[PDB]
Design a protein around this ligand. Structure first.
Ligand SMILES: Nc1nc2c(ncn2[C@@H]2O[C@H](COP(=O)(O)OP(=O)(O)OP(=O)(O)O)[C@@H](O)[C@H]2O)c(=O)[nH]1
Ligand SMILES: [Mg+2]
Lengths: 415, 18, 180, 178
């Protein structure tokens, strides 16, 4: 139940404001900046502020803070979801989210803001559907918004019927400084870019552990997805009844399902790093990277960030394979490797200087984060089985999909 | 070609389960 | 400079002109404006705001701005005085108790120093009941002969039939343009 | 500046009226007190172009509490636009009518809301569901006098599940203040 959705800037100027209820004075935004400054300088800054009886719940964008005032006990989660939908719409309409578009796209921004939410209740958020009634370059609204299917416009015709899938893996690892891994979760993400003719009803089928157990095939390699979050197109009743994944894909690239399950297997990359930090004299970086992944897979663009001293200078890198660059902006040793064959082992021996005078305040120990991205490798073992493309007109679809394995929260706690 | 693994064709349904 | 393009446009007509339509409420002004625009007897509620339309006839774009006669809308006629070339007064001969009020309103609106080039245009509306007067009794009662520097002309128009609107339009066109 | 903008907006060319509307919208966005020209933009409101009517409606909504007295010259326009065959224009008019925080304007807006309540267009029904709640927030007794609760209740018993969800949200908002 937001009161006024506004767009701020990095200096406190309200780039654009659009009140939906009028229950909050338009001059209350002037106190948001001083309140945020007071909160950030005392450690009490929060995305949801409070100006007397008025709360300012907002998120931080690339260059603007999407603040939305409210007064009653509105659903803060609803406000956050509306802000996220607005950010996604802005990203879909404008390729960049900066001040260069707020002062230049006011003609369409006001229309989008007016159409998106009325009286504090958003009603339309489909960027592909919204692109048919509000344009920056108007006919009656499409029947898709009034119709039940509000994510697939009817009458779409293409010369071919190509659906490209993207099974992107997310390897998140939380390795403590003692050498054990605490949080090792794998978050699957099936992102497809559908290009079909008509309103096809895709019937996705994978090698799910629950599906295999129900069929009676609970003995082969089946992914044990603890959490499966389907898109709005996926029918919840069909999935709940017998694990039937039936949904009409939209036109373009979108996130169909987002799997999330834990993993009890050894890490793909083992990072044995040591720190021979002499007191104000020098330091050594005995970093060893052991690839526990399969030797048949190659991790393209391996980037193991090694946080070196913030005041380190005159650095030297004695490594084995891969370029080693020290970035003073990020204050870390960027162990960049282009191609790392599975089972490979690269050894590096860093050595940098240190000022004689000690620092005034502590600097902390940022965790070492690898940036491995191994294509054509599914760690969870989930394999797509079938995709029932059904159309009333009748056509022969050509489904396609690729598996990409990358690093998620692949951090390693330092000593 | 494409970085992250070559795209592969998918089936239509579980042909082995009718 | 050369104005040959203006002469070429005038070879087929260039002047459009404008017009105003004010008067007391329930005076048949909306029905007349609709007949001039469309040509049908449309039923409309009293004009809370105003109506703006155009009339295409005799190569002149007769833009008409219908104005209601509400008490709260009576002082709102000053907004149309900016960039105004014409003025049409619709009389209501079927309301004797409102004739004095209509005359007072016309005199108050006729006492403005900005509307000097706007000629008078009195239209006798509601020409369907036997109680309606002629085209001389209304002029004598309103004292239209005492309007110095005002080109007024009385025309009887029947809302139900539509006769007399053409004569008033022709008179307005002859008053606006002074050519062949 | 202001005189030139008023002269441009009081012209007969649409190519200048659209630019004047855009400049007026940008000046208010830039933080300019443009409420002084509220009666001047009112004349250039009933236009066939849809890109200009939205800007006028937004200016009127943002310039409604500041000049409630000058706002009385827009009820007829809303009434005339609440019957256009295009659903987008009717929905915009319905949305702008409830956004005007004027006590002397919401009284006459009941007839268009009642007409649009049973509209076949789902977008119009969805807009009217939010408009009924917006009107009830301003005048609670006016909504009860107009008898909108009975109409709101039957909206849940209708098709167009988006309209049903909008009606449910409006009923929840009304009952929360009840
Ligand atoms: N019987 C009959 N009634 C007429 C005739 N002409 C006008 N009227 C009456 O005059 C009234 C005025 O109708 P409109 O023209 O729509 O409204 P208006 O004259 O602009 O008056 P306001 O809207 O209040 O400013 C109508 O309700 C009719 O009842 C006519 O030719 N015959
Ligand atoms: Mg009228």
């Amino acid at each position: 139940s937001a009161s006024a959705v506004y767009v701020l800037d990095l200096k406190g100027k309200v780039l654009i404001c659009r009140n939906y209820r009028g229950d909050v004075d338009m001059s209350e935004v002037e106190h948001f900046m001083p309140i945020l400054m007071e909160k950030e300088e005392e450690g009490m800054l929060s995305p949801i502020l409070a100006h007397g009886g008025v709360r300012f719940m907002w998120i931080k964008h690339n260059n603007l803070y999407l603040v939305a005032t409210s007064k009653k006990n509105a659903c803060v989660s609803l406000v956050f979801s509306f802000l996220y939908k607005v950010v996604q719409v802005f990203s879909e309409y404008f390729k960049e989210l900066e001040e260069e578009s707020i002062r230049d796209n006011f003609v369409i921004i006001y229309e989008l803001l007016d159409e998106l939410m009325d009286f504090g209740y958003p009603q339309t958020t489909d960027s592909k559907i919204l692109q048919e009634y509000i344009t920056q370059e108007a006919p009656r609204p499409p029947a898709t918004v009034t119709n039940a299917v509000s994510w697939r416009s009817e009458g779409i015709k293409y010369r071919k019927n190509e659906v490209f899938l993207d099974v992107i893996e997310a390897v998140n690892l939380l390795v403590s400084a003692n050498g054990n891994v605490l949080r090792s979760e794998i978050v699957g993400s099936i992102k497809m870019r559908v290009f079909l003719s008509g309103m096809p009803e895709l019937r996705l089928g994978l090698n799910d552990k629950v599906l295999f157990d129900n069929t009676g095939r609970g003995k082969s390699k089946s992914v044990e997805l603890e959490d499966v979050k389907f898109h709005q197109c996926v029918r919840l009743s069909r999935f709940e009844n017998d694990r039937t994944i039936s949904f009409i894909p939209p036109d373009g690239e979108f996130e169909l399902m987002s799997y999330r399950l834990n993993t009890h297997v050894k890490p793909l990359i083992w990072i044995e790093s040591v720190i021979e930090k002499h007191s104000h004299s020098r330091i050594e970086y005995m970093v060893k990277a052991k690839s526990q992944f399969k030797r048949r897979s190659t991790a393209n663009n391996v980037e193991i960030h090694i946080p070196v001293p913030n005041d380190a200078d005159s650095p030297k890198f004695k490594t084995t394979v891969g370029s080693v660059k020290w970035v003073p902006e990020n204050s870390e040793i960027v162990w960049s490797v282009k191609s790392f064959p599975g089972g490979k082992e690269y050894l590096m021996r860093a050595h940098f200087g240190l000022p004689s005078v000690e620092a005034e305040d502590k600097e902390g120990k940022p965790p070492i984060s690898v940036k491995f991205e191994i294509p054509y490798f599914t760690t969870s073992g989930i394999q797509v089985r079938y995709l029932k493309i059904i159309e009333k007109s009748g056509y022969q679809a050509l489904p396609w999909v690729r598996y990409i394995t990358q690093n998620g929260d692949y951090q390693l706690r330092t000593q | 070609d494409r970085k992250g693994g070559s795209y592969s064709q998918a089936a239509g349904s579980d042909s082995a389960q009718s | 400079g050369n104005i040959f393009a203006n002469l070429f446009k005038g070879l087929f007509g260039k002047k459009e002109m404008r017009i105003l339509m004010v008067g007391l409420d329930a005076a048949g002004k909306t029905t007349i404006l609709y007949k001039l625009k469309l040509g049908e007897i449309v039923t409309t509620i009293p004009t809370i705001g105003f109506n703006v339309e155009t009339v295409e006839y005799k190569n002149i774009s007769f833009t008409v701005w219908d104005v209601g006669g509400q008490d709260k809308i009576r002082p709102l006629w000053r907004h149309y005085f900016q960039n105004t070339q014409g003025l049409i007064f619709v009389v209501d001969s079927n309301d004797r108790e409102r004739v004095n009020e209509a005359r007072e309103e016309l005199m108050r609106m006729l006492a403005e120093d900005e509307l000097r080039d706007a000629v008078l245009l009195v239209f006798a509306n509601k020409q369907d009941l036997p109680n309606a007067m002629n085209a001389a009794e209304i002029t004598d009662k309103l004292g239209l002969h005492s309007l110095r520097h005002r080109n007024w002309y009385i025309q009887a128009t029947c809302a139900t039939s539509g006769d007399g609107l053409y004569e008033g339009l022709d008179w307005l066109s002859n008053q606006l343009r002074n050519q062949k | 500046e202001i005189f030139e903008l008023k002269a441009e907006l009081n012209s007969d060319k649409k190519e200048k009226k659209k630019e004047a509307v855009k400049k007026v919208i940008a000046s208010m966005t830039v933080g300019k007190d443009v409420s002084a020209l509220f009666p001047d933009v009112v004349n250039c409101m009933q236009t066939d172009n849809l890109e200009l009517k939205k800007l006028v409606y937004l200016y009127l909504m943002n310039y409604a509490k500041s000049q409630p007295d000058m706002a009385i010259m827009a009820v007829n326009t809303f009434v005339k636009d609440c019957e256009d065959p295009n659903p987008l224009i009717r929905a915009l008019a319905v949305r702008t009518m409830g956004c005007i925080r004027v006590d002397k304007i919401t009284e006459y807006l009941c007839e268009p809301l009642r007409k649009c309540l049973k509209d076949e267009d789902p977008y119009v029904r969805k807009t009217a569901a939010v408009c009924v709640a917006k009107l009830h927030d301003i005048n609670a007794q006016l909504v009860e006098d107009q008898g909108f609760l009975d109409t709101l209740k039957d909206l849940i018993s209708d098709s167009n599940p988006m309209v049903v969800a909008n009606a449910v949200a409006a009923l929840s908002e009304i009952a929360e203040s009840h």
